[PDB]
Each structure stands twice: as structure tokens, then as C-alpha cells.
Amino acid sequence: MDIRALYDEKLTTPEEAVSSIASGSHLSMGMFAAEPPALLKALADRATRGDIGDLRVYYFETAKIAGDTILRYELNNRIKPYSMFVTAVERALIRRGIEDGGRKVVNYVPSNFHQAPRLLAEEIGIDTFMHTVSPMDCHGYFSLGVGNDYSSRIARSARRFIVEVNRYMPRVQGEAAAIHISEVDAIVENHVPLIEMPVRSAIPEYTSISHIIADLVPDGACLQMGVGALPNLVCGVLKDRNDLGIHTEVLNPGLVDLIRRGVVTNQRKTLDRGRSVFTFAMGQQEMYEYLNDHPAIFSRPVDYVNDPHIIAQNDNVVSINATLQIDLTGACNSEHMLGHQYSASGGQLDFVRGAYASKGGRSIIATPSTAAKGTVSRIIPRIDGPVTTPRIDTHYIVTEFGAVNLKGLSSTERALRIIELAHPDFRDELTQAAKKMHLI
Amino acid sequence: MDIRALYDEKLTTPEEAVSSIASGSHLSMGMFAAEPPALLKALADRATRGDIGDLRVYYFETAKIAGDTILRYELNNRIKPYSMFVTAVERALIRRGIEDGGRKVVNYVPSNFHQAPRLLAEEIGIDTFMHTVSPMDCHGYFSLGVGNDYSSRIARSARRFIVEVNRYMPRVQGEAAAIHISEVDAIVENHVPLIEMPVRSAIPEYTSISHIIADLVPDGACLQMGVGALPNLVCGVLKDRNDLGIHTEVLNPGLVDLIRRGVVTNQRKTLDRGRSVFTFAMGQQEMYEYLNDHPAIFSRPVDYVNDPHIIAQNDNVVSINATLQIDLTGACNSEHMLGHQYSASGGQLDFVRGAYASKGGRSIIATPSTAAKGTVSRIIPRIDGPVTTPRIDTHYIVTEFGAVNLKGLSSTERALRIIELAHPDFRDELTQAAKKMHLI
């Protein structure tokens, strides 16, 4: 089996590589940084030329890469976004559509991220899959790098798999993370830095928040850190710990810093002992570079990583997630769009459930108590509509004013303890609302 | 070892049995038919005489026995309902309380039923547990009979366990279903028929619904279903099947009929092969008598039965649940009280999740399309507030007009297909609503 010959055989231009994708078919691509820019630019060009139509693209975790190519508003009639998370890119599209005669331009597909591999392969069906990969090694394998998720599965289930080789994509070890040249239909090469998450600055509230959380992290904790600035930054208060583990949905810079520092050994885990487990990674160049050939990091597919039964196997799980609002029932909301709920597709609830089921486990959902320079309360009477984390599932809630374990508390006990986590400026107003709702 | 000597030492009157329960303590009891009428009457009398106070009662599945005695409105100032399900009994109390100067008289404790054993025993803590049991056998064991649920844990974890022996309570085999006299603190005897779930008349829509559902059940299916005329009718249609299995939260007369007919054999199950598994039972005298000493019926605790990971290990699970409303997003609502959501505490979602995870599994949620002589649609634009089954979890929905599998469908595809399950009188209005909501 000659790999070098197979490679040359499949190597081609972005233009020719995407030239065969059928109108009326289903396409998917990797998450975030994995989105292949050369391939997506060439696909967008096809649409611009009017050479493809009715192409449904099903995907999670949008990046400017897709935002600026296939997803551009002008192509919305030809490349139809079947978005499975609604992010800043989709929010902008949706608002533009509303302005343009109330046009629906984003087709949200409700789902559980943890079920994405089966949903895409079996319910939806994907004909073409495209993903950035690390360069082929001397045994004929590419790596999915920062992506496993549903990507490992759809790379195989799709009729055609097209890869974009990028020397900047780290070579990552993981379950089905390695792709043999024989599993690939076409190859293009494009060496450019991976897209980064924005770096964010700490706010004063994070000191209290991080301090409160630290007191809640037991010896040998097995960490998951949710998306957002808060869990990424709170991670740093654990610099002084030892023998921590990682089993997380998203691998972020804060977690990788703990690995770098030797804080994370993974020696107290039941599953994947000795290796930090994640399903996809987002960060900056320093983090991406560090992942390359790292023998103590191991990606796994999302249907493993985000299975609460699997999460719970490891003792002393600590899940730290952020939210946008907490209401007086103890329900939480991470959705930016008022009156909508797309964020429930995320893996937050998987870890809320999984951490609580872990022996010695704790789920923490945290937020500053206010927004807009202290003028807006993030502790509210009642969330408008369907929630992200239901009140029956919430475990620990934290603001800069303290922590409350909600499990086993009555609705009266909950409302009273939650009001005390609000900023003093709002407690009277919240107490009256609770009275009106008959929560107390 | 001398069990008759132990029985005689522990045997007492209901009045004496409940006399040492502390004020300001936590009491729990069995579910439904499990509630002990003589003990509960004696406890209520104790409150009436002003001899106990600040007694919190934590419980699920209320029955007339509880409503008639301890839960009587007039005793609300001494015996505090910390209800974990809100049923007809609590709805009546809540409404009466609002009328009576807007008083809060029921204190809902949000939870997952599947976590009840741990929540009651650990976060909440139970000082006294009371449960009706079958007569002591020659080895010194009583059976919890109709109830396992969280009862088998709390009978052991409560600081005192008081039983009410009733020869009408069947001797049921199960995991931790049998409790030795050495584990019982006091005994009273009260032989009276168990309370029955009322038999309700079928509505016309159930004929079509039971056939659509039955068409979705293959031979070898492993069934879970609720109580009522509809499930009874479904079981009626299923009388022609073979080698069905049972793994259900509640065991009902319909399922027991299939056992009696030899339709249910449990030979195709992966877990508990050969035995019908349930966590509590509700029905009529004929069904209760049938459970007595049945070697092929096996109760198990709710943290096993309602664990989606456990449910999913059996192939071809079919979960059949009812709902009150379905909205155009595919979310379902089972809560009777407008604007509120107490029904999410029930096990419906456990089985929605577990059935989908099962190999060949299907979760079905069914409702007639209208209410009130066809004047009100049960298919609605949008549920008012938090839901029972989230749109991200719904699998199959059914009305008298057919069935839809929602998995993998966009918001537009869902709305369009769901409207076709609504009564013709409402389809135009629902389509308009869908457009306004920007679903389509």
C-alpha cells in the first residue's frame, strides 16, 4: 500500500475538490477552527457563480471562517444554514433577515449536541463532509486535531470526505481522531494560523466567584469547564492543586494551563486514567501549538464525552459552567436572544446531570449578579420562555455574593437563598416579585 | 431470630406508633396505595389535638388517603406539605390557599423522581418513614408490595421505619422490596382493600391513537407506559404480539393483562431477562391480587428503573407517554396548572431519553388533538413557560391524525409536520401563528 501515491492521487485544488458537491444535498463540516477556509471559500465561490443551489449545511459552533464564506447573507438562497447552535454569526444573519421583510434565513435544527453523531449520520444524512486536518504522517494518517465531536463519525458516514491539510492544525491523539488516507476522497493544502477565541479580561466579580468555587473543588477533582470567559478564567484559581483530572466537552486555554503546570495528572480518574479527555478545542495559537503530539491528551467523540453515565463514572467531577440569567426558581438561561432558546442544544445540561451523578461530584453554574455597569440584574424573577438548565437539575449556583446548593430545597427556600445571591440593589424588588409569584 | 417475639414487641396502635415523631422533623411515606391509612389518620389526629407541629412531609403520588387525613387544609399550619409531585389533591389546596388571603399552603420541592432515593435520604434527610406492607412471612420479612420507588431506600435510611401491615398488600418480589423485621421500628395492622386508580371511560380519539401507537410497537418491544384508558386500549391492541418485555415506571392493569395473556415474556430483554420490571404499581383490586407472589414480576428502585442508561440497555424499547399540549416547536406540556410546571418532576423525560437511546427504541408522546368538545386545540403555538418535554428531546408525537418523528427536523419542518397532526379546524390558525413566530 503506497500512501505517497494515494496522496498525490487525491491532492487537488479547492476549486476542483468542491466542484462535485450536488445541488439539493446535505453537507457538514468541523466545528470552529476546524472549518476549512480554502474549501469553504471555494464552495462559496460556486454559490456566488450560481453553480450550486439548495445545499443544506448542518453544523455546530460557527467561526468567522464560515461566517465570511458560505454563510454570507448574499448566498442564503443557495447555501441554506441548518444551524445546530445559534451563535453570534447566526444572530447577525437572523436580525438581517428580519429587517429584510421578515425573512427566515437560518434554519435552526433542535437537538442534543451529545446525540449529534447519530442525528447527522442516521436521521439527517450527510453526503459531503469537510474538515481541516493535520498533515498526513508516515503511516498514512491525518488527525482531526482540535476536532472530534461528531466529526470522527461523519467523516466516515458521509459519501465523500474532503480534507484541508494545514500544518498549523495540531496532531492530536484520540478515539477515531486519526483518519487513514484510504478513508479520504480528496485533499487540499492550506497552511494558515487557526482562528482564535478572543482573549477576555477578568472582571472584579471573578475574584470572589473563583474564590467561592475553589472552596468547592475537592481533592482529585475531575474538571469540565463550560464555554465562555468565566469558566476559562476561573480555572486559574486551581494552579495550586494536585492530581486533578480533566473530562471536558470543550478544551480551553485555562484547562491546558493546568495541564502545562502539572496540576492535572488524571491519576484519580476511573475512565481514561492518565489522559485529559475533550471533544473539541478552542483557544489561541499557544494552546493549539501545545496540543501537537501531546501524549497525555486524548480526544473522544461527543456521544462518549457528553454522556452523563460516562461523566459520572469518574469520582469528584466538578463542572463549572456560566449562564446569563438565573431566576428565582433556580432555573438558568444561557441564551442571548430574548424570548428564544437555542442554547439548550449545548452540553451544559449533560455536565450538570453528569457532575451530580458522580460520586462526590458537584455541578456549578456561575454568573456575576449584574450586567450593564450594575444597572441590570442577572438574577431575575422568571426566565422568559424555555430554559437552559431546568430548576429540577440545578445543583450549585454561584455569584460574587456566595454559593447555594439548590438540591432538596423547597421553592420558598430556593427563592430566599437565590435573592441573597443577587446584588443588594435588587433584593427588595426580587423579594416583592417572589411574593407576587407566590414563591414565598 | 425470634421473629414472633420481635413482632409482639414492635406491634402497637396507630396512635402510639406516631406518638414519638418529633415536631420540626421530616417525614416521608410510600406512593399512592402505599400511603398507610391508619398511621396517617393517627398522625392527622395528633395535629388536630395540637400535639405536633412544624412537621414537613416529603412525598410523591398523593392518594385520597393522604388528602383526607394529614393533607387536610385545616391542618396545614402543623403538617406542611413538601409535595414533590403536584396532583389533583395539591391543586385543590393551592387554589384554596390563594383564595384564602393568597396563602402559600403547598411547598413544592423541585426534583427528578429518578433521584428521589438520594435526595430524600441525603440532601433532605428523613426522620420517619411510613409505608403499608404485606404480612410478615415465616422468615421475618415484610414486602413493600406495590411500592419500591424511593421507598426501598428510605425505609432503610430513615431514622425510624413504621409499617402498616395489610393482608390486601401483595407480597411482591424485587430488589430491596423485602424488609426484615429487625429493620422495622414499629408495626400496626390495618386490613383494608388498597385504594384504586379509578377506571375512566375512553374517548373516541383513543381508537385511532391506540392503533397508530400499536403500529409503532414491534414484536420483542420492551414496554413502558402510564395509566389510563389509552394505555389500556393500546395493550388491548397489543394482545396479538409475542415476546414483549416490560420495563416501566408504573405498572398498570393494561400491562398486567399482557403478562396474564402470555404476550409479555421478557425473553428479548438484555437486563432482567424473564421478569417484568417496575418501580411502583397503580390499578384495581384484580391487578393488585395478581401481583402477589408472582415469580415473573420484579420491582426495582426508581434510580435503576428510571436511569436512561439502564432503560437503553434493552433493545426495542417503546415508551408510551401522554401529554396535555404540544406546541409548534415540538415541546410537550403535561402540567395542568396554567403558567406553572410541576410535572417535570415525573419520569416522563427519563423514558423519552432512554427509549431514544435504546437500539431500535422509540419514544412516543400522544394526545387527542383537541379538548372541550373540540373547541380548544391541544396543539398550540407555544407552551406558556417551562415545558415538560423539551423540543430537543421529543422523538415521536401522536394524535388521532397520525404520527411524526421530530428528530433531525428543522424548526420549519417541525412546525409544518406538527400542524398536520392538529384538528383541521385549527390548522390555518396554527400556520399563521407559525409564520408570526418565524418558525416558517
Author numbering:
A (entry chain B), B (entry chain A): 1 to 440
Give excerpts from the publication.
Thus, ripA and ripB along with a third gene ripC, constitute a novel virulence operon designated rip (required for intracellular proliferation), thought to be important in intracellular replication of Y. pestis in macrophages. The ripA gene encodes for a protein highly homologous to 4-hydroxybutyrate-CoA transferase (4-HB-CoAT), which belongs to a superfamily of CoA transferases responsible for the transfer of the CoAS− anion from a donor CoA thioester to an acceptor free acid. Further, CoA transferase activity assays suggest that RipA has a preference for butyryl or propionyl moieties compared to 4-hydroxybutyryl. Herein, we suggest that in INF-g activated macrophages, RipA, a proposed butyryl-CoA transferase, produces butyrate that indirectly lowers the macrophage NO levels, preventing bacterial cell death.
Additionally, we report the 1.9 Å crystal structure of tetrameric RipA and demonstrate that this oligomeric state is stable in solution suggesting that the physiologically relevant assembly of RipA is tetrameric. Two homodimers form a doughnut-like tetramer where the buried surface area between each monomer at the dimer-dimer interface of the tetramer is 1454 Å2 (calculated with AreaiMol), which is ∼8.2% of the total surface area. The dimer-dimer interface is facilitated by weak interactions between residues from both domains. Although a network of ordered dimer-dimer interface waters facilitates tetramer formation in both RipA and YdiF, the increased buried surface and direct residue contacts found in RipA likely results in a more stable tetramer. As there are no existing butyryl-CoA transferase structures, the 1.9 Å RipA crystal structure, which demonstrates the canonical Family I CoA transferases α/β fold, is compared against 4-HB-CoAT structures. The overall fold amongst the RipA and 4-HB-CoAT structures are highly conserved with RMSDs between 1.57–1.68 Å in pairwise structural alignments. The RipA structure most likely represents a form similar to the unbound form crystallized with glycerol, as RipA was also crystallized with glycerol. With the exception of Glu61, which is protonated and polar, the pocket is entirely apolar, resembling those described in C. aminobutyricum 4-HBCoAT and SCOT with Phe85, Phe60 and Phe113 conserved in all 4-HBCoATs. The pocket size, which restricts the size of the acyl group that can bind effectively, appears to be large enough to accommodate acyl groups of three to four carbon atoms and helps explain the competition and DSF assays.
